Design a protein around this ligand. Sequence first.
Ligand SMILES: NC(=O)c1ccccc1-c1ccc2c(c1)Nc1ccccc1NC2=O
Length: 268
Amino acid sequence: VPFVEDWDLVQTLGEGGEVQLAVNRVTEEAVAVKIVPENIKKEICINKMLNHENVVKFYGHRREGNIQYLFLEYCSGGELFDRIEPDIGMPEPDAQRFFHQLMAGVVYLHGIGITHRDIKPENLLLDERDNLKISDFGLATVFRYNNRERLLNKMCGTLPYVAPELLKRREFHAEPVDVWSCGIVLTAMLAGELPWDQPSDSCQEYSDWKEKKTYLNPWKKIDSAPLALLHKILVENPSARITIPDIKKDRWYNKPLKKGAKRPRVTS
Ligand SMILES: NC(=O)c1ccccc1-c1ccc2c(c1)Nc1ccccc1NC2=O
């Protein structure tokens, strides 16, 4: 079938090079095209690994000289970031559903030995049905290979979402770092604000949290059941921090809160 390989670039999705919303000339299928060294070669390689309903799908890549094109799943719902109302958050059942989907995605990634390393609401994309998808594997790396764990040492992520061990220790396990960023994402969804600039003793807000001053913001806006979960996630010691199998056993995580998607109905 002719022209099925042609895509029109219709809108800029952000700055990374750049990312464009591409529409197929024949089928009108929407895809996200990432337009760009060894850093992109690693992103393509990790993306070729990924196959999950809560992970942005990689369709392929093409090279045209110095320009590399990455064909990725387009998520029409945009970023989770824009579902968070400043200093308010979002309804608790929506945040619980987004957190369930975030956990399923992170369980998948850790299962194949991949750590994202930069989980934040700007990277958590939503599809047409508001299904959360983990995106941007530009800072992602392999932490388990041939069933052997590789401890990490590289400084990366975004400071409000980074685990405290990254700023304090030379080496750290990959998985508790992603669990921590997920907890900061959960905090943002329920309070509409970030708890600290960075998780260090020099940060008053971080010291207040370790001293359990939950009568202060953002913790005052958060109900006791999700707050009890945040108390288990945001634990300074990464070895004492709750693992994902135990997050799945938490009382709020298993609390019936949200109704299914409004399905059409008639009466009489
Ligand atoms: N998250 C990314 O991979 C990315 C990296 C750098 C710059 C932009 C993006 C990006 C890619 C795709 C989307 C996106 C940002 N966000 C977005 C914003 C508004 C509407 C739709 C989308 N969907 C998307 O699928």
